[PDB]
Amino acid sequence: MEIVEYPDPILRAKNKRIDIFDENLKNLVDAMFDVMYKTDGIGLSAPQVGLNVQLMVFNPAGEPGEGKEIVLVNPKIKKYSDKLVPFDEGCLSFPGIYAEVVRPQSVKIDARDITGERFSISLSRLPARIFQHEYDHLEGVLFFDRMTDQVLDSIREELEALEKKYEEKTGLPSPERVEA
Ligand SMILES: O=C(Cc1c[nH]c2ccc(Br)cc12)NO
Ligand SMILES: [Zn+2]
Ligand SMILES: [Zn+2]
Ligand SMILES: [Zn+2]
Ligand SMILES: [Zn+2]
Ligand SMILES: [Zn+2]
């Protein structure tokens, strides 16, 4: 298994509905949760393992045995709160990079679960926060898109480094450059 990283395009590709709700789907969520636990994270959205399908899993506590291992599939934000708050985020598709992103305090959400049931959770604190972070992955949108002109100024050079690693490995030019 392996985490996809920035500039890699699978990060921007349209993400599909899921509809069979089979056993493979259980099996996927093992491996998303386990890769998460292995890289010490608190969320992970499926295109970060190379699958373009709306599926995110996560667990605020982010340590085994602790918190609560939530799964949303086909999320949609019904509502976003007015309240706005900063927070240093990291994202695994950007090894080692943390920069402050500013986002809505709470969200209401509609979504299916691992057996198909729709449902309807609201969400705050860290939970909500991650939710959104993975919620963006589902939808083409990476954390530095959410940063303020100044902040991004602080990571230009790092994400540039990434673009080059991609370029060295792939032979191809970086399908997207942050000087853009
Ligand atoms: O790469 C990841 C997981 C992750 C790791 N460290 C974090 C700190 C803040 C936030 Br919000 C998310 C993370 N999700 O796409
Ligand atoms: Zn592997
Ligand atoms: Zn299908
Ligand atoms: Zn497991
Ligand atoms: Zn930890
Ligand atoms: Zn991420």
Author numbering: 1 to 180
Task: Provide text from the study.
Here, we explore the precise structural inhibitory mechanism of actinonin, which is a slow, tight-binding inhibitor of peptide deformylase (PDF), a metal cation-dependent enzyme. PDF is the first enzyme in the N-terminal methionine excision pathway, an essential and ubiquitous process that contributes to the diversity of N-terminal amino acids. The function of the active-site metal is to activate the reactive water molecule involved in peptide hydrolysis. Actinonin is a natural product with antibiotic activity that inhibits PDF by mimicking the structure of its natural substrates (nascent peptide chains starting with Fo-Met-Aaa, where Fo is a formyl group and Aaa is any amino acid) in their transition state.
In this respect, we studied the binding of compound 6b, a PDF ligand that does not exhibit a reactive group at this position. We observed that this compound binds strongly to both EcPDF (KI*  = 63±6 nM) and AtPDF (KI*  = 400±35 nM) but, unlike actinonin, does not display slow, tight binding as KI*  =  KI. This impact on binding is consistent with the absence of the hydrogen bond involving the first carbonyl group of the ligand. The 3D structure of AtPDF was determined after soaking the compound in crystals of the free, open AtPDF form. Upon binding, 6b induced a complete conformational change, identical to that observed with actinonin (“O” state). This result further suggests that the conformational change is not induced initially by the formation of this hydrogen bond and that the encounter complex is primarily driven by the fit within the S1' pocket. The 3D structure also revealed that both the P1' and the hydroxamate groups are bound similarly to the corresponding groups of actinonin. As expected, no additional bonding occurs, especially around the backbone nitrogen of Ile42. Taken together, these data allow us to conclude that the conformational change observed upon ligand binding is triggered primarily by binding in the S1' pocket. As revealed by the binding of 6b, the one carbon longer metal-binding group fits, immediately upon recognition of the P1' group, in the S1' pocket and forms a bidentate complex with the metal cation, mimicking the transition state as a result.
